Write a structure and sequence with these properties.
CATH architecture: 3-Layer(aba) Sandwich
Bound molecules: copper (II) ion
CATH topology: Lysozyme-like
Subcellular location: Membrane
Protein name: Peptidoglycan-recognition protein LF
Number of domains: 1
Strand order of the largest sheet: 1-4-3-5-2-6
Helix content: 25-40%
Largest sheet: 6 strands, mixed
Family: Belongs to the N-acetylmuramoyl-L-alanine amidase 2 family.
CATH superfamily: Peptidoglycan recognition protein-like
PDB class: immune system
Distance between the termini: 32 Å
Order of helices and strands: EEHEEEHEHH
Shape: globular
Function: Peptidoglycan-recognition protein probably involved in innate immunity by binding to peptidoglycans (PGN) of bacteria and activating the immune response.
Number of strands: 6
Number of helices: 4
Structural class: alpha/beta
Radius of gyration: 14 Å
């Protein structure tokens, strides 16, 4: 279940932003450092609120992430596959971001949230958005941040395609 901008009731982007050359080789895992969401209506509310924060507080053209996944086990489309993402605690790696909605410092995401990210990535490969040999990194490997949270970072150690280096 993938909710696009029309389904999470988002605003259109306020301007253009550099395109991503596809397929991309890297996925970067974030957390949103907000409350999590375990049912669609709450996830949609969170998405709207995060988009507003990014657009109004930071002045960005759109919610910063390419994709987000909710504790409801659903995928939320942010900027999508074709547009470069933007992130607090920035980095320049050519990649697509997936933000786990929530804060995973001392709690883990439910299985269904992790499974949503996995499903998103396999679809990326099928539709030629992600290279077949793509690698997965944590935001904190690339920038001085806690993101995606200690507990989620621990879980990632055993993920297929997770790259320590
Ligand atoms: Cu949909």
């Amino acid at each position: 279940h993938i909710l696009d901008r029309s389904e999470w009731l988002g605003e259109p982007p306020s301007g253009k932003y550099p395109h991503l050359k596809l397929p991309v080789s890297n996925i970067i895992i974030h957390h949103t450092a907000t409350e999590g969401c375990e049912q669609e209506d709450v996830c949609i509310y969170r998405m709207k609120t995060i988009q507003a924060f990014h657009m109004k507080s930071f002045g960005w053209v759109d919610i910063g992430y390419n994709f987000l996944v909710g504790g409801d086990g659903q995928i939320y489309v942010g900027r999508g596959w074709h547009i470069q993402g933007q992130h607090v605690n920035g980095y320049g790696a050519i990649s697509v971001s997936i933000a786990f909605i929530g804060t995973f410092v001392n709690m883990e995401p439910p299985a269904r949230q992790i499974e949503a990210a996995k499903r998103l990535m396999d679809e990326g490969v099928r539709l030629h958005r992600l290279q077949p040999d793509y690698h997965i990194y944590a935001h904190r490997q690339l920038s001085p941040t806690e993101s995606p949270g200690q507990k989620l970072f621990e879980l990632m150690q055993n993920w297929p395609r997770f790259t320590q280096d």
